[PDB]
C-alpha cells in the first residue's frame, strides 16, 4: 500500500496473508472455511495465515491453516485478467472471534464515489520496493466507469472497476494482490492490477466481486 497508514493490530479481522515461506498475496475470509483472493495468486503449497499483523513475528492470535483446494474461476484469462478471482478452501475451519472474522459478500454493486478500505502487506514505494512488517490501510473511492475507461482504454471489462486517486501518491501495489476492498461492511473488490503503483492518472483496478456472488455461493455449496 503506497500512501496508506498502519491499520492497527487486528483491526481488519478478515484480512488473510497467503504464505509459501514468504507473504505473496492477500485474501479475505468470507466464512470459517473459505477465503477469496485473486486468480493470479494461484500457487500450490499455500498456507493461509489469519489474525496477522506483523507478518515476521509470532505475536499471538495467528492461526496458520493449509489450503485444501484452490479454485481459480474457469474463465480466468491471464492475459486480460478478466475474471481474476479464486476461492480457497481451508483444511480446517478457522476459529472466529473478535480478531479473526469473516466479511460479508455484497448484495448489490457499489456506486462511483463510495469510499472503501483497501489493506495489505504489499510494497509501500512507488519507485522502489519497501515491504512493511505490519498491515497497511488506505481509504479510497470507487471511480466512475468513464474515468476508469479513460485511464485504461480497451482494458477494462465489466468485471473490473477503478478505485484510488488520479493525482497519484496513494494506491495498492505489488504484494497487495488478492486483498480486500471493503465498502460499507461488504467485500466489493479484490486487488487485481494497475500500471505501476500510485502513478498519476493510473488508478488501481479491482475485480468486481458483486458480479460473482452467485458463482461463489454455488461453488462453495458444491465443495
Ligand atoms: N493498484 C496497483 N497499481 C497495483 C495492483 C496490483 C499489482 C500487482 C499486479 N501487477 C501489475 O498490475 C503490474 N503492472 S503492469 O506491469 O502494468 C500489468 C498490468 C496489467 C496486466 C494485465 C495482464 C497481464 C499483465 C499485466 C501487467 C500483479 O501482481 N499481477 C500478476 C501478474 C499479471 C499482472 C498482475 C500492482 C499494482
Ligand atoms: Ca505475526
UniProtKB/Swiss-Prot annotation:
Species, as recorded: Bos taurus
Binding site for Ca(2+): 52, 54, 57, 62
Residues involved in substrate binding: 171-172, 174-175, 177
SUPFAM superfamilies (alphabetical): Trypsin-like serine proteases
Catalytic residues identified in the record: 40 (charge relay system), 84 (charge relay system), 177 (charge relay system)
Post-translational modification (record): Subsequent cleavage after Lys-125 leads to alpha-trypsin. Further cleavage after Lys-170 yields pseudotrypsin. A cleavage may also occur after Arg-99. Not sulfated on tyrosine residue(s).
Assembly mode: Interacts with SERPINA1.
Matches recorded under Pfam families: Trypsin (PF00089)
The protein, known as: Serine protease 1
GO BP: digestion; proteolysis
GO CC annotation: extracellular space; serine protease inhibitor complex
Annotated gene: PRSS1
Peptidase S1 domain sequence ranges: 1-221
Catalytic activity: Preferential cleavage: Arg-|-Xaa, Lys-|-Xaa
Keyword annotations: Calcium, Digestion, Disulfide bond, Hydrolase, Metal-binding, Protease, Secreted, Serine protease, Signal, Zymogen
Keyword DNA-binding: no
Family to which this protein belongs: Belongs to the peptidase S1 family.
Entry note: cofactor: Binds 1 Ca(2+) ion per subunit.
Molecular function terms, GO-annotated: endopeptidase activity; metal ion binding; serine-type endopeptidase activity; serpin family protein binding
Amino acid at each position: 500500500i503506497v500512501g496508506g497508514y498502519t491499520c492497527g493490530a487486528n483491526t481488519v479481522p478478515y484480512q488473510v496473508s497467503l504464505n509459501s515461506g514468504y507473504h505473496f498475496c492477500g485474501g479475505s475470509l468470507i466464512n470459517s472455511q473459505w477465503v477469496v483472493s485473486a486468480a493470479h495468486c494461484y500457487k500450490s503449497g499455500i498456507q493461509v495465515r489469519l489474525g496477522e499483523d506483523n507478518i515476521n513475528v509470532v505475536e499471538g492470535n495467528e492461526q496458520f491453516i493449509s489450503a485444501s483446494k484452490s479454485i481459480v474461476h474457469p474463465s480466468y484469462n491471464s492475459n486480460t485478467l478478466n475474471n481474476d478471482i479464486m476461492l480457497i478452501k481451508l483444511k480446517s475451519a478457522a476459529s472466529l472471534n473478535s480478531r479473526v472474522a469473516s466479511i460479508s459478500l455484497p448484495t448489490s454493486c457499489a456506486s462511483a464515489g463510495t469510499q472503501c478500505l483497501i489493506s495489505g502487506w504489499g510494497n509501500t514505494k512507488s519507485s522502489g520496493t519497501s515491504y512493511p512488517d505490519v498491515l497497511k490501510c488506505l481509504k479510497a473511492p470507487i471511480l466512475s466507469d468513464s474515468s476508469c475507461k479513460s485511464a485504461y482504454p480497451g482494458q477494462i471489462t465489466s468485471n473490473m472497476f477503478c478505485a484510488g486517486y488520479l493525482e497519484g501518491g496513494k494506491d495498492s501495489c505489488q504484494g497487495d494482490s488478492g486483498g480486500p476492498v471493503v465498502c460499507s461492511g461488504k467485500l466489493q473488490g479484490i486487488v487485481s492490477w494497475g500500471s505501476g503503483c500510485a502513478q498519476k492518472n493510473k488508478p488501481g483496478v479491482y475485480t468486481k466481486v458483486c458480479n460473482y456472488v452467485s458463482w461463489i455461493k454455488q461453488t462453495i455449496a458444491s465443495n
